[PDB]
Amino acid sequence: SPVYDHTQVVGLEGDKRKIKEWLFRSNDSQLLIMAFVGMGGLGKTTIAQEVFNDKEIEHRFERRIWVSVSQTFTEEQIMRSILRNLGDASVGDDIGTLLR
Amino acid sequence: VFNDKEIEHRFERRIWVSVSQTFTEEQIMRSILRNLGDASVGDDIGTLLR
Amino acid sequence: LQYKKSKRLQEINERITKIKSQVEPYFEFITPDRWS
Ligand SMILES: Nc1ncnc2c1ncn2[C@H]1C[C@H](O)[C@@H](COP(=O)(O)OP(=O)(O)OP(=O)(O)O)O1
């Protein structure tokens, strides 16, 4: 989840800076996709949480969306979690309506 | 304690949560939501802390 | 004679029963879409 503490987060200002200047170049592509690749327990979720709980990013993006995917998952729960993060009601519903 | 009156003037939103031997995380989360005043919405965990 | 055919029946019956008997405990051990 995007809820963390930002007091124990030992300095990530360089990585945060670089990823923020990557996100300011969003319009220069059609759909900017980025990857945080590393081994287990290295900082990937926390560097993402440190990124999009900043304020410049929150002014930039209207609808920021967190999605948890795991080992065990299914497609429609990912879809309706995106719907919940957007603001749609959690409606018992099927998959072809969700993308529409 | 928290059915006294001085405490009820002090705290805006007092919350009881039952945890037991058998429990799970998301039911604790949505019970906190119910005690707050949010609707009991069928929902997943990452939205609940937000 | 019926002798050769009876022993053929014996061998194939015993192989079937043996395969059942040694497969069955593995099933005893464990228990267990497209859109547009
Ligand atoms: N810079 C940091 N300062 C303080 N704590 C940190 C820092 N980076 C990571 N942590 C802590 C947060 C968590 O308690 C723990 C695991 O990190 P986390 O980001 O959740 O893992 P990860 O995203 O690298 O991999 P995974 O999600 O696969 O476990 O490390």
**For residues A23 and A51, is the Cβ–Cβ distance under 8 A?**
yes
Instruction: Give dist(CA C20, CA B4) in Å, integer.
Output: 71
Q: Is C34 on the interface with A (CB under 8 A)?
A: no
Asked if A1's CB is within 8 angstroms of B43's CB, the reply is: no
Under DSSP, the state recorded for B20 is -
Q: Is A74 on the interface with C (CB under 8 A)?
A: no
Which residues lie closer than 8 Å to B41 by C-beta, 6 or more apart? A90
Instruction: Give dist(CA A4, CA A51) in Å, integer.
Output: 12
Distance from first CA to last CA of chain C, Å, rounded? 65
- Read out DSSP for C1-36? --HHHHHHHHHHHHHHHHHHHHHHHHHHH-------
- The CA-atom distances, in angstroms, between A98 and each of A19, A68, A69, A91, B45 are 31, 17, 17, 10, 20
Amino acid found at B27: Q
Q: Is the shortest distance between the CB of A42 and ligand 1 below 6 Å?
A: yes
Q: Torsion angle, CA of B50/A39/A79/A29, rounded to 10 degrees? A: 100
Instruction: Give dist(CA A5, CA A23) in Å, integer.
Output: 23
The reported resolution of this PDB entry, expressed in Å, is 3.4
Amino acid found at A48: A
